[PDB]
Amino acid sequence: KGKFLSNLSQATNALTQAVVASPVHAATGAKVLGADDDLDFTLPGLMPIEWQRFYNSRDERRDGLLGAGWSLPYEISVQIEPHPRLLYIDEQGRRIDMGSSPGEGLSVRRNENGQLLIESSDGIYRLFEPLPGDSSRLRLSLLGDRNDNRLHLEYDSSGRLWLLRDTFEQAQLELSYSTLWPGRIAQVERLYPDQQREVLVSYDYDAAGDLAQVRDSEGQVQRRFAYDAGHRMIEHQLATGLRCFYQWTQFADQQWRVTRHWTDEGDSYQYDYDLEAGITQVTDSLQRLSRRRWNSQLQIVEYTDNLNQTWAFEWNDERQLLSATDPLGGRYAYSYDETGNLIAETDPLGHSHSTLWLEHWSLPQTLTDPAGESWHLRYDPRGNCIAEVDPLGQVTQYRHDAHGQVVEIIDAAGRSRKMRWNSSGQLLEHLDCSGYPTRFEYDRRGNVKAIIDALGEHTRFHYDCQGRLLSSQLADGRAEHFQRSSNGQLQGYTDPSGYTTLYQYNRRGQIRQRIDAHGRQVRFDYDAYGRLLALTNENGESYRFAWDAGNRLSEQQDLDGSAKRYGYDLLNNVVELQSHPAPAPIIHRFERDAVGRLLAKITDDGRSQYTYDPLNQLTAASFTDNLGNQQALSFSYDALGQLLEEHTVAGSLIHRYDELGNLTQTQLPDKRWLNRLYYGSGHLHQINLDGQVVSDFQRDRLHREVLRTQGQISTRSEYDRCGRLRARLQHSERHLEYDDSDNLVGLAERHATGQHRQLFHYDATGRIIASQDGLQGQKETFAYDAAANLLDGPKAGAGLVVHNKLLTYQDKRYRYDAFGRMIEKRSGRRGVQRFAYDAEHRLIEVRNQTSSGETLVRMRYDVLGRRISKSEYDSQGNLLGETRFVWDGLRLLQEQRNQQTSLYVYEDLGHAPLARVDGLGAQQKIRYYHNDLNGLPQQLCEPDGHSVWQARYQVWGNTVEEIREPYYIEEQNLRFQGQYLDRETGLHFNTFRFYDPDIGRFTTPDPIGLAGGLNLYQYAPNPIGWIDPLGWNYHVFEKLTKQFEVA
């Protein structure tokens, strides 16, 4: 009735690092070798067929379909023995003796007059039948799920598995044996309705019948093995060529345990055992040491890593985990149910997750969050989910078909989605809230041959015999080709424009070399143990890394020599960060709770304090200066984490959402309301502000704006079949011509009158090299070095820009500090400028020389790094001006200057501007932007199309060639997405870094480092089809196409 014995969060990771070492179990000096590497193939169906092999070296079965050690899921066996009764052998090779009936080991048995049925924790059940000629042994006959889906097995004479048949009584697989080893499988074949055949895998055996070689349908060897006299494996070789060699030894227990492992790359490991005390030691060539201590049950109780971190565990009968204890004393505790189902977990902070299950099956009925909010589920008598209920009370409904496949979803507000499924378990037709279907088409092998959208456009795919993708193709005719090698360790991607990108790997599968279209070679270097050491750039400059015993990043060196050194606590968390300049240091210190979450940051600039909710969602923040004033922020979320209120020194921001999660409306500090009427996502979306209609959108069957109303005038859009914007018109005009790579190469502005046209030229890698205008009034040419450092024209057509330090370009000159930060800039338009930086690498003070002398501008930053105020002082500290900002989640919303207020309204959730509102009350005036494809504005129109402000730009940095305004006084500063012009210095702000439009580069390296790319000063390959609004949610520390810690 239970206790069926056998013989073999942060806590869930510590436990998994000690149970197994190197595939080598810790307590048992054995092997376990099962993963996707041994997953020979997989077939579609209501019940998938997964051919997963397993090797243990501890099972006692000397014979089988694949030899000693190896096992297959369909070799399950049941034996009946005298009481000193019933025994079950699983896929993993664990001998389970039940006896004469739920068990805590996740196994259920019940015997019927004619057969026996075993159900696991989930709905999968397996049915045995008596073995012909033997009443003391049983063999697998049927498999099934909670639904009616099932698999049958048909055996041959001599009791050898022959066929596997599906629920519809149709054969799928067939086994073929040999003559030398009739008990060993040789080939596996697949059957189609056409009575055809196709081989999937082949096996070759040694002189002892032990599996030695595996081959695919294409005859390419994938895996090799070798064996000792006792059938114990000593060598296994993967597909990439990597060879692992083992050794075995005999102990006083008359059981064989592994003692030594090595490879062809120099990696080595040595194991030592002391069974009296249950102690296991592991040693490496690097002199690293690991220690484990286990109990008589062969369960781990003590773990000691290379760093002397100590973990302890407590075990209960039936092999359940009760408690885990960390080096700091923090205790994780668990509590189960009578059936073994987990009920509660509690962590050192005392925040508990709880769940209440059912009785018929192991299904969760209620879930509880640490805050107390609960999720409710109610099921169908067959186990299928029928409805879900959230804390807010909003319900969701599902309908399940006969075979347990969902066919209709009803969400809140009555929105309905419907689906049709294939007999093999493959989706065919999907419908949205409206009648807009997307359909699929499948090939004989069961892959996605084609996809059909609402408009009827077809996309086609051509696969290999093994399913590996080769080509993708569109209706317009463009195609993409992929080149791969099973063992060649080479891959290639061919752009629709014909250009190829190559990748080369190593024996471990790690990327080693990349080659671009123009031969730019990027290389990587690895240690014997697989740890990255050097990353070598296109030009030759290399970044370097150095790792500690625990494989935690210790030191990072950039191109210029600037180094970062990290210090880790006893629980694998950083507490000290040191930045050393290239040939004084900067130190940041941290203080964190028992869990990983951060409380305090200390810098020479001051102190920062944080406060979270039990769900690890930030609720309060503070910064206190060094003997100075203090500022603070507060937040307030909803039951689902939705942010409802944000309170700061500026005031209060209030949001209200819909049941679908959309942002229905918002309230400003000035108490005005923004309302947005969603239909989930579709037509007749509207923006109303406080009662004044601003813009109403009419959308197409893909939910793309085809018409936009901007007052008394309307704007229309026309898109291509492939989905690219082709033309735009404005009548109460413009055309874009692209390339095969979707780059923008031509832009016509007039068709009804003398056409004005513009051109751009790109390299194969997207870098823009030239620019011309149809008026012939402009001409620009750009030259780039490898690694994308701009060059000063043909004067320096060839030459290395060291460390990506741009020193001169035309009349500009730059100077750089030891940390890579610009300090001095020299030009003619605005003279010489100097900059000063905070400890967090932020810009505070800019000094400029003017006819009035040395003017100054100082920037004020909030706790999170956002910009709130800017102040300009003339000489002798005489204030000239001040401007203040109001954000809305990393997106500018309002700005305020002397008796002036400006509100920005965007389109959708992007940074792209749509409308600008000036003044309050009767003084409110509404104006509309006319943006380009990149969001860069070109004219600002009142109603009736009056161009109040017009601009023309260069390609880079939207540097102004001409601007014109009449009586309108407010300045336009938006420029690119995320940017705001600072006329007092001429450098854009973005959100976290300043941008120099003269050279198209940032003035300081990326705070996050290599995550942003190899070049730390780069904005993008081209500013016409790329964006980088952040220049880098909430950032506790510190690109897109058209380790740092966060919340």
Q: Could you list the residues that contact a copy of itself (CB under 8 A)? A: 178-179, 194-197, 215, 218-220, 462-466, 470-471, 481, 483, 488, 490, 494-500, 516-520, 537-541, 558-560, 739-741, 745-746, 759, 761, 763-765, 785-787, 794-795, 797, 800, 802-805
Contacts of 300 (CB under 8 A, 6+ apart): 15, 18, 19, 26, 27, 292, 293, 294, 313
Q: What is the Cα 1028 distance to its own chain's centre?
A: 19
- At 727, is the secondary structure helix, strand, or coil? strand
Which of 149/537 has CB closer to a copy of itself? 537
3-state helix, strand, coil in the chain (%, to 5): 5, 50, 45
> Residue 940, class by beta-carbon neighbours within 10 Å (0-12 exposed, 13-18 middle, 19+ buried)?
buried
Least distance (Å) from a copy of itself to the CB of residue 424?
Answer: 20
Least distance (Å) from a copy of itself to the CB of residue 723?
Answer: 15
Q: What is the Cα 430 distance to its own chain's centre?
A: 26
Distance CA 438, CA 427 (A): 10
Which of 196/308 has CB closer to a copy of itself? 196
Which of 601/803 has CB closer to a copy of itself? 803
Question: Euclidean distance between the first and final Cα of the chain, in Å?
Answer: 48
CA distances for 1021 relative to 796, 1017, 1026, angstroms: 20, 12, 7
Least distance (Å) from a copy of itself to the CB of residue 133?
Answer: 26
Least distance (Å) from a copy of itself to the CB of residue 802?
Answer: 8
Tokens 């005392």, residue located: 350
Least distance (Å) from a copy of itself to the CB of residue 439?
Answer: 24
Least distance (Å) from a copy of itself to the CB of residue 558?
Answer: 8
Q: What is the Cα 306 distance to its own chain's centre?
A: 30
Least distance (Å) from a copy of itself to the CB of residue 673?
Answer: 59
Which of 539/573 has CB closer to a copy of itself? 539
Which of 540/881 has CB closer to a copy of itself? 540
Which of 438/536 has CB closer to a copy of itself? 536
Which of 561/651 has CB closer to a copy of itself? 561
Residues 661 and 642: beta-carbon distance below 8 Å: yes
Distance CA 917, CA 903 (A): 5
Which of 498/530 has CB closer to a copy of itself? 498
Contacts of 883 (CB under 8 A, 6+ apart): 869, 870, 895, 896, 897
Distance CA 166, CA 44 (A): 11
Contacts of 681 (CB under 8 A, 6+ apart): 703
Least distance (Å) from a copy of itself to the CB of residue 488?
Answer: 8
Which of 8/722 has CB closer to a copy of itself? 722
C-beta atoms surrounding 24 within 10 Å: 20
**How many secondary structure helices (H) and strands (E) does the chain include?**
1, 91
Least distance (Å) from a copy of itself to the CB of residue 792?
Answer: 12
Q: What is the Cα 631 distance to its own chain's centre?
A: 35
Least distance (Å) from a copy of itself to the CB of residue 38?
Answer: 21
Residues in the chain after which the backbone breaks (C–N beyond 2.5 Å): 8, 22, 84, 100, 583, 732, 1032, 1038, 1042
- 660: tokens are 């679908």
> Residue 313, class by beta-carbon neighbours within 10 Å (0-12 exposed, 13-18 middle, 19+ buried)?
buried
Least distance (Å) from a copy of itself to the CB of residue 904?
Answer: 51
Least distance (Å) from a copy of itself to the CB of residue 221?
Answer: 8
Least distance (Å) from a copy of itself to the CB of residue 463?
Answer: 7
Q: What is the Cα 352 distance to its own chain's centre?
A: 28
- 130: tokens are 């008596």
Which of 394/497 has CB closer to a copy of itself? 497
How would DSSP label each residue in 893-928? EEEEETTEEEEEEESTTSS-EEEEEESSGGG-EEEE
Which of 472/622 has CB closer to a copy of itself? 472
Which of 438/539 has CB closer to a copy of itself? 539
Which of 339/486 has CB closer to a copy of itself? 486
